[PDB]
Amino acid sequence: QEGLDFPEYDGVDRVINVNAKNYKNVFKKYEVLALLYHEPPEDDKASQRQFEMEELILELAAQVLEDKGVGFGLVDSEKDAAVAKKLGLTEVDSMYVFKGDEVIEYDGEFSADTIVEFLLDVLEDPVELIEGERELQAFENIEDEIKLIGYFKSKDSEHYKAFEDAAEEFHPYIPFFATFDSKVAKKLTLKLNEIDFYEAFMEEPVTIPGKPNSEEEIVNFVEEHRRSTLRKLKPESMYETWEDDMDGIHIVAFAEEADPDGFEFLETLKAVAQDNTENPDLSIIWIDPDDFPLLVPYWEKTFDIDLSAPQIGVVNVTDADSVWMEMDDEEDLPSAEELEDWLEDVLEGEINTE
Amino acid sequence: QEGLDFPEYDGVDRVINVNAKNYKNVFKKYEVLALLYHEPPEDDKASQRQFEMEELILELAAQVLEDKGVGFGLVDSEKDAAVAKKLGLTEVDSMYVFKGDEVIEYDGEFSADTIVEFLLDVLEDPVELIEGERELQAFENIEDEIKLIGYFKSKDSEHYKAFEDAAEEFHPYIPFFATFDSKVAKKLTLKLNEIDFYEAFMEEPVTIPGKPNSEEEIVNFVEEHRRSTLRKLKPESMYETWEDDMDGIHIVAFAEEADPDGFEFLETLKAVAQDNTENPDLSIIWIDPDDFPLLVPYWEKTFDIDLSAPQIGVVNVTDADSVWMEMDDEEDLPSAEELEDWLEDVLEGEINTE
Ligand SMILES: [Ca+2]
Ligand SMILES: [Ca+2]
Ligand SMILES: [Ca+2]
Ligand SMILES: [Ca+2]
Ligand SMILES: [Ca+2]
Ligand SMILES: [Ca+2]
Ligand SMILES: [Ca+2]
Ligand SMILES: [Ca+2]
Ligand SMILES: [Ca+2]
Ligand SMILES: [Ca+2]
Ligand SMILES: [Ca+2]
Ligand SMILES: [Ca+2]
Ligand SMILES: [Ca+2]
Ligand SMILES: [Ca+2]
Ligand SMILES: [Ca+2]
Ligand SMILES: [Ca+2]
Ligand SMILES: [Ca+2]
Ligand SMILES: [Ca+2]
Ligand SMILES: [Ca+2]
Ligand SMILES: [Ca+2]
Ligand SMILES: [Ca+2]
Ligand SMILES: [Ca+2]
Ligand SMILES: [Ca+2]
Ligand SMILES: [Ca+2]
Ligand SMILES: [Ca+2]
Ligand SMILES: [Ca+2]
Ligand SMILES: [Ca+2]
Ligand SMILES: [Ca+2]
Ligand SMILES: [Ca+2]
Ligand SMILES: [Ca+2]
Ligand SMILES: [Ca+2]
Ligand SMILES: [Ca+2]
Ligand SMILES: [Ca+2]
Ligand SMILES: [Ca+2]
Ligand SMILES: [Ca+2]
Ligand SMILES: [Ca+2]
Ligand SMILES: [Ca+2]
Ligand SMILES: [Ca+2]
Ligand SMILES: [Ca+2]
Ligand SMILES: [Ca+2]
Ligand SMILES: [Ca+2]
């Protein structure tokens, strides 16, 4: 209770419809503005209470973040079509966050805490500094996300400023790090103004060519290397990741990292992904079921799998049709060779959902 | 949406009031029964709305976990005082989970996902086996919670069965591990029938004396060593931890593990905690603000601290009055000796909230 009191919605109306009349003043009122771009709801009671539930979630987030200068609004895809075209709102059910000169699309779990955590991340500065051996270890501990790190003279360096400009383009989904510490740069093998790109779960980085790097060179490189061989599904971006597949067919690996059997399978998956990381056609989404408890019974019934054991399979996003690697039980995990056999069969189409 | 469809409440009334007339019927209907013990809500509209919101959270959890044999019910502390006393429901706002011969008290964040995640943990078996070096590594990776591991001949061992009996008494809050692997036991330095107790964040375990250990011997040891020197606040048990104050105060350390500065402060805190782990009067609650986004603005306003930087201080649990260690900014972290001197001043009353 005292010192540990979750906020409860006070009923004050803070999330309003944004339209051609007020959108210019609403932007002036709030330093950071989050606009949910939505289609008009249907009269169905299941979709009626659904839409009212969404706005109340934004109402709680608006209350929690009021003092930090964050505002929330709603934009109707039909009623406010001219406003949506002017602002760049194009994907229904996405929430567009306006910070400075940037527009950030939120396409993640629509819950109050996930949205507030995301907005708190948006409020942070886009570049994290690294100085000393212990901060370097914190950088090295990052593995489940893409990361960049550059070595510059100081914050006054023109090349640091270009690095920060590029960081703003991907904020807050890709952490950018900068060091002015020559001893840190030496251990990372970074020469002056060099920037290293670390693919998720990869040990070895890729150095951005053509140093020093303009904002344009960094942004183009990151866009070219956007898709990791192994990606971890995260609530803040779960629908963006789920929708980011060419043929709507995912290789999905379920592994509970804290469980001994899940850990064993995760080791093999990471090693295979590392050994095959140059394959431009291989991409695997790792889901830790402990990150999505409300989806665990849904997954087990829809996929006909037991999520207390590791799994890897093929999922068709059209109708959740799926096929899974055969294991006798949790102790019959594939070797790296067996896993590589199975992935090659999936890429060739020999193993499929159809 | 297909493959990533969060469940929505279907309006079916699955959570009902459990009273002296129906309580035996309800226990018979469900394998596992979770009963929320609550006072009657106040009659004003806001109090009524908040109560209906909490029951809808339970209705969603009951819908998600219906096929797994879980049911939820409400017990009124005024209307149902007799049946509450008979069932051992004594702490208002606690949810008591009945599995087998055990009653598990839930005293954590009242959210649908946290509750469903907790119930899925309850449904798991209370002892996890360790076999092989890679599963041993998974055990060694556990550090933010108390863990026990024992070496027995097989599942048929009388001493394994006593170990499993004791595990059920702390399920699912303290993971119990067992190995029948002599190679794993040798690495852990476990002799046959020995049980090692690992306090959270400690590198060295404490062997339970008096092997072979009966259930009562294990339960008494764990209860006597229940409070770690450094314990992490977790949503599943946040109120149990917060209500376990030390003479009306908590020493609270805010540190974001993923942030380089939070990581640095966390290293020092873990080292000081290990160096002072024998002091029974020292206990520190580590809060990672990334784990409680909905409480971050509340904390910054209530404690008057900047949660973008690491913090440690004293919090009075009666009125949330607080005092915090002064640091210029996130780079002005205390050394291990400075942190230990500050903790000593707190334990002597030289630093206090009054
Ligand atoms: Ca509250
Ligand atoms: Ca509203
Ligand atoms: Ca969406
Ligand atoms: Ca831009
Ligand atoms: Ca989308
Ligand atoms: Ca954060
Ligand atoms: Ca700039
Ligand atoms: Ca730009
Ligand atoms: Ca981020
Ligand atoms: Ca290099
Ligand atoms: Ca260049
Ligand atoms: Ca999108
Ligand atoms: Ca595909
Ligand atoms: Ca297991
Ligand atoms: Ca196992
Ligand atoms: Ca790759
Ligand atoms: Ca979880
Ligand atoms: Ca195994
Ligand atoms: Ca096999
Ligand atoms: Ca099929
Ligand atoms: Ca749904
Ligand atoms: Ca009901
Ligand atoms: Ca409670
Ligand atoms: Ca309580
Ligand atoms: Ca949540
Ligand atoms: Ca779990
Ligand atoms: Ca037994
Ligand atoms: Ca017992
Ligand atoms: Ca647990
Ligand atoms: Ca030993
Ligand atoms: Ca004994
Ligand atoms: Ca309690
Ligand atoms: Ca920092
Ligand atoms: Ca720093
Ligand atoms: Ca201790
Ligand atoms: Ca978080
Ligand atoms: Ca204040
Ligand atoms: Ca100082
Ligand atoms: Ca630092
Ligand atoms: Ca002293
Ligand atoms: Ca005071």
Curated annotation (Swiss-Prot), chains A, B:
Single GO cellular component term: smooth endoplasmic reticulum
GO biological process, one term: regulation of skeletal muscle contraction by regulation of release of sequestered calcium ion
UniProt-reported outcome of changing G69D: In TAM1; increased calcium-dependent susceptibility to proteolytic degradation; decreased calcium-dependent aggregation; decreased calcium-dependent polymerization; no effect on subcellular localization; no effect on the subcellular localization of STIM1; decreased calcium content of intracellular stores; no effect of the ability to inhibit store-operated calcium entry (SOCE) activity; muscle fibers with the mutation have significantly decreased calcium-dependent sensitivity to caffeine
Glycosylation sites recorded in the entry for this protein: N316
Keyword entries, A-Z: Calcium, Disease variant, Endoplasmic reticulum, Glycoprotein, Membrane, Metal-binding, Mitochondrion, Muscle protein, Phosphoprotein, Sarcoplasmic reticulum, Signal
UniProt cross-references to SUPFAM superfamilies, sorted A to Z: Thioredoxin-like (SSF52833)
CDD domains per the UniProt record, alphabetical: PDI_b'_Calsequestrin_C, PDI_b_Calsequestrin_middle, PDI_b_Calsequestrin_N
GO MF annotation terms: calcium ion binding; identical protein binding
Phosphoserine: residues carrying this PTM: S47, S182
Pfam families recorded: Calsequestrin
Post-translational modification: N-glycosylated.
Expression sites by tissue: Expressed in myoblasts (at protein level).
Subunit-level organization: Monomer; increases in response to a depletion of intracellular calcium. Homodimer. Homotetramer and homopolymer. Can form linear homooligomers. Ca(2+) ions promote oligomerization. Interacts (via C-terminal end and preferentially with the monomeric form) with STIM1; this interaction increases in response to a depletion of intracellular calcium, decreases both STIM1 aggregation and clustering, interaction of STIM1 with ORAI1 and store-operated Ca(2+) entry (SOCE) activity. Interacts with ASPH and TRDN.
Disease: Myopathy, vacuolar, with CASQ1 aggregates: An autosomal dominant mild muscle disorder characterized by adult onset of muscle cramping and weakness as well as increased levels of serum creatine kinase. The disorder is not progressive, and some patients may be asymptomatic.
Protein name as it appears in the record: Calsequestrin-1
Source organism of the structure: Homo sapiens (Human)
Name of the gene this protein is made from: CASQ1
